[PDB]
Design a protein around this nucleic acid. Structure first.
Ligand code: MG
Ligand code: MG
Ligand code: MG
Ligand code: MG
Ligand code: MG
Ligand code: MG
Ligand code: MG
Ligand code: MG
Ligand code: MG
Ligand code: MG
Ligand code: MG
Ligand code: MG
Ligand code: MG
Ligand code: MG
Ligand code: MG
Ligand code: MG
Ligand code: MG
Ligand code: MG
Ligand code: MG
Ligand code: MG
Ligand code: MG
Ligand code: MG
Ligand code: MG
Ligand code: MG
Ligand code: MG
Ligand code: MG
Ligand code: MG
Ligand code: MG
Ligand code: MG
Ligand code: MG
Ligand code: MG
Ligand code: MG
Ligand code: MG
Ligand code: MG
Ligand code: MG
Ligand code: MG
Ligand code: MG
Ligand code: MG
Ligand code: MG
Ligand code: MG
Ligand code: MG
Ligand code: MG
Ligand code: MG
Lengths: 87, 85, 122, 79
RNA sequence: UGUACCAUUUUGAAUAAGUGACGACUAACUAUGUGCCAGCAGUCGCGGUAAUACAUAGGUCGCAAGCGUUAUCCGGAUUUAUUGGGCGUAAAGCAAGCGCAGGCGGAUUGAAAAGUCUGGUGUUAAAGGCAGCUGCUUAACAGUUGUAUGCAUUGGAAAC
RNA sequence: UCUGAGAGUUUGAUCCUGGCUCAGGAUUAACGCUGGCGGCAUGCCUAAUACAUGCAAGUCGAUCGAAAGUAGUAAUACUUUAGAGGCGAACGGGUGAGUAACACGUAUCCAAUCUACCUUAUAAUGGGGGAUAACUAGUUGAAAGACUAGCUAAUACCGCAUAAGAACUUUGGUUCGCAUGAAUCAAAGUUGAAAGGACCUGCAAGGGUUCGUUAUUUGAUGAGGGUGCGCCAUAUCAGCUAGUUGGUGGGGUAACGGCCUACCAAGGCAAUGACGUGUAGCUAUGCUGAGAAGUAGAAUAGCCACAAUGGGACUGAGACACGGCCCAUACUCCUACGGGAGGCAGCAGUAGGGAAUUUUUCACAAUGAGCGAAAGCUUGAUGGAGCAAUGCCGCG
RNA sequence: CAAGGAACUCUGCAAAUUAACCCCGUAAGUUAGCGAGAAGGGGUGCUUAUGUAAAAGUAAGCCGCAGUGAAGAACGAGGGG
């Protein structure tokens, strides 16, 4: 029940996220298993320096993304590679 | 096949006065945290002489751990070099 | 019928395990104390975490008797141990709870607080 | 100081306990009857009750397996 | 949240300075009062009628929206000294001996490889640590990449 | 490529041994004086003391009967939810009382284990039956409720037919292992499944997507056990241990195991510190030091333990369950005197202790969780805003 | 002899409790011999079976308010002269 999801590690009035593979029952901002890549709500462009390597391994393993997590994958195009690799 | 390998320990028998037992003693040379000198220790593990191994007192015996057969017994005897006493 | 120098139990939370009667209060040569009677007592067996200390002279009212007494209808109420609870001048219990059952003779002689703090009246 | 979910859960588990206890008692009486007057016939009934309970979860699957293996050992020894 | 911020928007220096110390360690001194009295003090110590050490005042110095005092931890302290101390006269050689276990230990050869050294792999969670960079008016701060330490296993070295 | 500052003080004066004090940092800090603002962060160290009051885990009508409301002549259409059922309530949040040992850190072996939902792959999802919530009526009550008799529904429950594969054995082969021992067959015997919902098409018959279900398969996550090493003070604590040590057969546990049982024995640990006493959550880390290391385990993060005190168990993939259940103890409160109610070490706040540490706040808007197809819904986690020169930084 | 239990009296005088056997456990002090039957507790009947030379004991069952069912069997602790 690994779940690629976010983790807030910014400061007051300035969030900062990191895509990460973690279990569902682990608290947010806690212990995790593997690092994918970071995010910034105000990076203008390239807001999601993705990895494109282990992420495909964990999704193939069966990781369940989230709504905002999925969103990031689509603008780069990671959803395409995952679904076509399934096929 | 590929089978994870168990840990081994080489020791000497100190006493044997029960049914199927052998109180072996294993030594080690752990360093000292501050004065940095080797110190000889002594700890007495127990094992079972199920058979074919006997290993009476004074017999230099090698020891491999095993699933706990009982409380305080988690080791088994094996090959015996320098059979004496 | 509790009499002079009678050891009896306390049915409340106050730290007093054994209490000894000193005087059967009420008149001259009052021989016995029946249910509802007030007596002067001395704490003899107490506990460290108790409001009373060993040796204090205090006033108590009896609630149970081994001998028992007979009511007007003919019913004879009889307990298995003599018990008393420590009371204050106002007739208000010193403890915050009462253990075990109590008689109905208390109701006649006031003692409404004792009845309301009991487990069940008999 | 109380939650309807917790209250409802307590009310449901009383009924579940009744039903599961009935099922467990049948297995207990059946294995005792079997080993009483030993007979290869009974053995079958033992399998049916143990496997069914194991699927429903009422009994841990491992306990059914150990009971099954051990009861079959008695028959082979006696036959 | 009509919040940060912005503008040639009105008024206008207007709405804003305290605390410790001044004999030495320790940058900074005079007068008045008191007269072993009243008081100060982290240490040495000041006060007995000419007090730069007390009280007040003026001056001056150290700090600053903070300044002093108190409490606790570390350093300085080589003042429990493995690194890194001593035992004649300053603290410290038992009154002396026989001595098991422990520690140490002559020379040469062979083997093994437990110490010892080295290569490969795994791991030592993330934050923090140090270096670089970015973003907040720069900073504090946040993010970013880099950055060891030990353990286990395996392959070699053979001087002690 | 690391990298270290001293001074005062015994004497009439000097040298040395030697103790005391100071110059530097630092804190969950407090007190006195004073006091303008902004950006970050911190904020009961004590009484794991007791708590007023209000909030802190629910969700699905696309599982099911019924009821209610609004429109409609009617058939019916829409909305709402007390109850049955599924799922989640074991996550998340708080505190550090207990605990000196496999608790924890590290490395490991689980030929001695579990894992619901999730991943891959593979067979089925046919047909019956008996019940009870809601409702009605009666008794008992102010009400909470409780008891009694009838009425219904299903993805609730219980049989039956059926096994691609499963589980337990039997027959001999295979490949063997680290001692118990695993690994693979071919044949056979024995045993064992469930449930439908939404929508589309089709005159119909039938067909179809999707959710969901049973039986398996792959992994992964999470949980559990054992072991080596490391991990406080004290000898002005020297013996301790009788399920303690071992074997046998049996029972139990997810599993090995004196975990339990009956028998047979007398061992095990201990001066290389047992046992006892006192103390303490451990670790990554914080402060300090040139370094070796000393010191505290703020905040936060990993692991353990706890939920007024002490025990037991149900349900479940997972609890012996903070705001579930049962019992006892202590404490408080309500009553119409028969009976009951309660657990702020969840967010605030109150009383008390203290030298001393804050809103009885707003919103799920972002992140996160639980249920749902969505609409959504619930989130004192979380995100903000108050408060305080509490610390760093900046400007007047 | 119901309730109380030394309130009686110069004084627990007298009376009352315990009492046999078997199985647990037993302190301060000491001249190391004792204290000590210390203190404090438990079981006892009948039947069946197993145990033995006989037992004692062990397991199951039965009855009564009570089972050395009656007789005979030590009350104890602490301080002082
Ligand atoms: Mg053995
Ligand atoms: Mg179960
Ligand atoms: Mg002064
Ligand atoms: Mg002056
Ligand atoms: Mg020092
Ligand atoms: Mg030092
Ligand atoms: Mg010296
Ligand atoms: Mg000398
Ligand atoms: Mg000499
Ligand atoms: Mg001498
Ligand atoms: Mg000599
Ligand atoms: Mg020697
Ligand atoms: Mg790290
Ligand atoms: Mg940072
Ligand atoms: Mg001098
Ligand atoms: Mg200083
Ligand atoms: Mg509803
Ligand atoms: Mg709960
Ligand atoms: Mg919890
Ligand atoms: Mg929190
Ligand atoms: Mg706390
Ligand atoms: Mg589930
Ligand atoms: Mg049906
Ligand atoms: Mg069938
Ligand atoms: Mg079903
Ligand atoms: Mg055994
Ligand atoms: Mg503690
Ligand atoms: Mg130093
Ligand atoms: Mg902390
Ligand atoms: Mg804390
Ligand atoms: Mg609560
Ligand atoms: Mg609170
Ligand atoms: Mg509490
Ligand atoms: Mg939300
Ligand atoms: Mg500040
Ligand atoms: Mg500043
Ligand atoms: Mg009498
Ligand atoms: Mg009497
Ligand atoms: Mg008298
Ligand atoms: Mg008299
Ligand atoms: Mg006499
Ligand atoms: Mg005596
Ligand atoms: Mg005398």
């Amino acid at each position: 029940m690994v779940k690629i999801r976010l983790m807030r590690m910014g400061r007051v009035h300035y969030p900062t996220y990191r895509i990460v593979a973690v279990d569902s029952r682990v608290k947010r901002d806690g212990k995790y298993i593997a690092l994918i890549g970071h995010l910034n709500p105000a990076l203008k462009e390239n807001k999601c320096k993705i990895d494109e390597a282990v992420a495909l391994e964990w999704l193939n393993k069966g990781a369940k993304p989230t709504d905002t997590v999925r969103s990031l994958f689509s603008q780069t195009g990671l959803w395409k590679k995952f679904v076509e690799s399934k096929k | 096949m590929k089978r994870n390998q168990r840990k081994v320990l080489i020791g000497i028998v100190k006493s044997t006065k029960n049914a199927k037992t052998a109180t072996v003693q294993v030594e080690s040379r752990f360093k000292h945290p501050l004065y940095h000198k080797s110190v000889v220790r002594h700890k007495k593990y127990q094992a079972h002489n199920e058979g074919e191994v006997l290993a009476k007192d004074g017999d230099k015996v090698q020891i491999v751990e095993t699933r706990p057969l009982s409380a305080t017994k988690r080791f088994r005897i094996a090959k015996i070099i320098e059979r004496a006493k | 019928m509790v009499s002079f120098m009678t050891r009896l139990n306390v049915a409340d939370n106050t730290g007093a395990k054994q209490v000894g009667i000193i005087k059967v209060l009420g008149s001259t040569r009052k021989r016995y104390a029946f249910l509802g009677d007030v007596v002067v007592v001395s704490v003899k067996d107490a506990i460290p975490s108790g409001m009373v200390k060993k040796g204090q002279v205090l006033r108590a009212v009896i609630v149970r008797t081994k001998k028992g007494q007979q009511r007007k209808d003919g019913t004879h109420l009889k307990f298995d141990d003599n018990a008393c609870v420590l009371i204050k001048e106002d007739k208000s219990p010193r403890g915050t709870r009462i253990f075990g059952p109590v008689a109905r003779e208390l109701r006649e002689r006031g003692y409404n607080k004792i009845l309301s703090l009991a487990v069940e009246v008999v | 100081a109380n939650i309807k979910s917790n209250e409802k859960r307590l009310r449901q588990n009383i009924k579940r306990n009744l039903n599961n206890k009935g099922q467990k008692t049948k297995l207990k009486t059946n294995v005792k009857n079997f080993h009483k007057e030993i007979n290869l016939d009974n053995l079958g009934n033992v399998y049916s009750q143990a496997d069914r309970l194991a699927r429903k979860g009422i009994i841990s699957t491992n306990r059914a397996r150990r009971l099954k293996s051990r009861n079959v050992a008695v028959l082979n020894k006696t036959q």
